[PDB]
Design a protein around this motif. Structure first.
Motif, PDB file in Angstrom:
ATOM      1  N   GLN A 200       0.810  -1.216   0.000  1.00 11.70           N
ATOM      2  CA  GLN A 200       0.000   0.000   0.000  1.00 11.70           C
ATOM      3  C   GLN A 200       0.847   1.271   0.000  1.00 11.70           C
ATOM      4  N   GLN A 201       2.005   1.230   0.646  1.00 10.88           N
ATOM      5  CA  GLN A 201       2.830   2.405   0.697  1.00 10.88           C
ATOM      6  C   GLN A 201       3.760   2.409  -0.507  1.00 10.88           C
ATOM      7  N   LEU A 202       4.095   1.213  -0.976  1.00  5.76           N
ATOM      8  CA  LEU A 202       5.068   1.043  -2.033  1.00  5.76           C
ATOM      9  C   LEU A 202       4.508   1.442  -3.388  1.00  5.76           C
ATOM     10  N   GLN A 203       3.238   1.797  -3.443  1.00 13.98           N
ATOM     11  CA  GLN A 203       2.622   2.260  -4.684  1.00 13.98           C
ATOM     12  C   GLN A 203       2.841   3.759  -4.820  1.00 13.98           C
ATOM     13  N   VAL A 204       3.217   4.372  -3.728  1.00 18.97           N
ATOM     14  CA  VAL A 204       3.425   5.801  -3.675  1.00 18.97           C
ATOM     15  C   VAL A 204       4.912   6.127  -3.633  1.00 18.97           C
ATOM     16  N   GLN A 205       5.543   5.666  -2.599  1.00 21.71           N
ATOM     17  CA  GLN A 205       6.924   6.005  -2.291  1.00 21.71           C
ATOM     18  C   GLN A 205       7.850   4.833  -2.521  1.00 21.71           C
ATOM     19  N   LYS A 206       7.726   4.281  -3.714  1.00 20.70           N
ATOM     20  CA  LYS A 206       8.386   3.046  -4.275  1.00 20.70           C
ATOM     21  C   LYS A 206       9.684   2.529  -3.583  1.00 20.70           C
ATOM     22  N   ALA A 207      10.511   3.403  -3.132  1.00 18.22           N
ATOM     23  CA  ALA A 207      11.729   3.055  -2.468  1.00 18.22           C
ATOM     24  C   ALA A 207      11.604   3.304  -0.973  1.00 18.22           C
ATOM     25  N   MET A 208      11.594   2.261  -0.178  1.00 18.74           N
ATOM     26  CA  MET A 208      11.543   2.437   1.263  1.00 18.74           C
ATOM     27  C   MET A 208      12.385   1.445   2.021  1.00 18.74           C
ATOM     28  N   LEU A 209      12.689   1.776   3.227  1.00 16.96           N
ATOM     29  CA  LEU A 209      13.519   0.967   4.085  1.00 16.96           C
ATOM     30  C   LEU A 209      12.728  -0.229   4.612  1.00 16.96           C
ATOM     31  N   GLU A 210      13.399  -1.337   4.822  1.00 14.36           N
ATOM     32  CA  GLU A 210      12.745  -2.494   5.386  1.00 14.36           C
ATOM     33  C   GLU A 210      12.961  -2.527   6.889  1.00 14.36           C
ATOM     34  N   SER A 211      14.227  -2.387   7.304  1.00 16.39           N
ATOM     35  CA  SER A 211      14.647  -2.326   8.711  1.00 16.39           C
ATOM     36  C   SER A 211      16.110  -1.884   8.809  1.00 16.39           C
ATOM     37  N   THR A 212      16.546  -1.630  10.029  1.00 19.47           N
ATOM     38  CA  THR A 212      17.896  -1.217  10.342  1.00 19.47           C
ATOM     39  C   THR A 212      18.557  -2.268  11.238  1.00 19.47           C
ATOM     40  N   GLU A 213      19.790  -2.619  10.964  1.00 23.01           N
ATOM     41  CA  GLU A 213      20.505  -3.573  11.799  1.00 23.01           C
ATOM     42  C   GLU A 213      21.896  -3.035  12.130  1.00 23.01           C
ATOM     43  N   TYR A 214      22.328  -3.207  13.365  1.00 24.09           N
ATOM     44  CA  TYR A 214      23.665  -2.766  13.768  1.00 24.09           C
ATOM     45  C   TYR A 214      24.679  -3.709  13.178  1.00 24.09           C
ATOM     46  N   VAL A 215      25.895  -3.275  13.069  1.00 27.38           N
ATOM     47  CA  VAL A 215      26.919  -4.137  12.571  1.00 27.38           C
ATOM     48  C   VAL A 215      27.800  -4.578  13.736  1.00 27.38           C
ATOM     49  N   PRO A 216      27.815  -5.882  14.057  1.00 28.95           N
ATOM     50  CA  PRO A 216      28.609  -6.410  15.163  1.00 28.95           C
ATOM     51  C   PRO A 216      30.109  -6.204  14.946  1.00 28.95           C
ATOM     52  N   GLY A 217      30.669  -5.269  15.666  1.00 32.75           N
ATOM     53  CA  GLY A 217      32.088  -5.033  15.590  1.00 32.75           C
ATOM     54  C   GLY A 217      32.450  -3.894  14.667  1.00 32.75           C
ATOM     55  N   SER A 218      31.465  -3.238  14.105  1.00 35.49           N
ATOM     56  CA  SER A 218      31.724  -2.130  13.233  1.00 35.49           C
ATOM     57  C   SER A 218      30.942  -0.914  13.685  1.00 35.49           C
ATOM     58  N   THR A 219      31.567   0.235  13.602  1.00 37.68           N
ATOM     59  CA  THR A 219      31.011   1.472  14.076  1.00 37.68           C
ATOM     60  C   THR A 219      30.012   2.050  13.040  1.00 37.68           C
ATOM     61  N   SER A 220      29.017   1.251  12.674  1.00 34.15           N
ATOM     62  CA  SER A 220      28.024   1.605  11.676  1.00 34.15           C
ATOM     63  C   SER A 220      26.775   0.726  11.824  1.00 34.15           C
ATOM     64  N   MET A 221      25.761   1.068  11.077  1.00 37.17           N
ATOM     65  CA  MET A 221      24.497   0.360  11.036  1.00 37.17           C
ATOM     66  C   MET A 221      24.177   0.159   9.559  1.00 37.17           C
TER      67      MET A 221
END
Length: 139
Positions: free
Chosen positions: A25-46
């Motif tokens: 329903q949202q992907l018909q409008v704003q075609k590109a969207m995030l699914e989720s965020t995950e931290y990186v084990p041992g890296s200073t980033s997500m």
């Protein structure tokens, strides 16, 4: 969409595909969207996975963030996950800057996706609560 795991996860206050219906329903409008965020084990980033709707082979997924009012944007060209597109939707990922396990004071980071295709540039932008993450771990 919607990776729920009892472990180090960022505190989001935005919209994420909770169900395939809600996703579509949202992907018909704003075609590109995030699914989720995950931290990186041992890296200073997500790392985040963005799902885009294949409407154009020539597609661009730019991740722009700002901890600011948006006078600045790092423009990260997201990396397409090989063979993720099964005809309809593609998956891209990107790494972000440092996060809570390293700095957890509420650093902030609002990102948005610039999906430039042959049939328009689809901005994944929301009510302000775009991809607003408050740099803090779950528990």
């Amino acid at each position: 969409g919607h990776m729920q795991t009892e472990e180090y996860v960022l505190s989001p206050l935005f919209d994420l595909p909770a169900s395939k219906e809600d996703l579509m329903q949202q992907l018909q409008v704003q075609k590109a969207m995030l699914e989720s965020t995950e931290y990186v084990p041992g890296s200073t980033s997500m790392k985040g996975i963005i799902r885009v709707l294949n409407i154009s082979f020539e597609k661009l997924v730019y991740v722009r963030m700002s901890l600011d009012d948006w006078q600045t944007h790092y423009d990260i060209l997201a990396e397409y996950v090989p063979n993720s597109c099964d005809g309809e939707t593609d998956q891209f990922s990107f790494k972000i800057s440092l996060v809570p396990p390293y700095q957890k004071d509420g650093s902030k980071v609002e990102f948005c996706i610039r999906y430039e295709t042959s049939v328009g540039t689809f901005w994944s932008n929301n009510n302000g609560t775009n991809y607003t993450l408050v740099c803090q771990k779950k528990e």
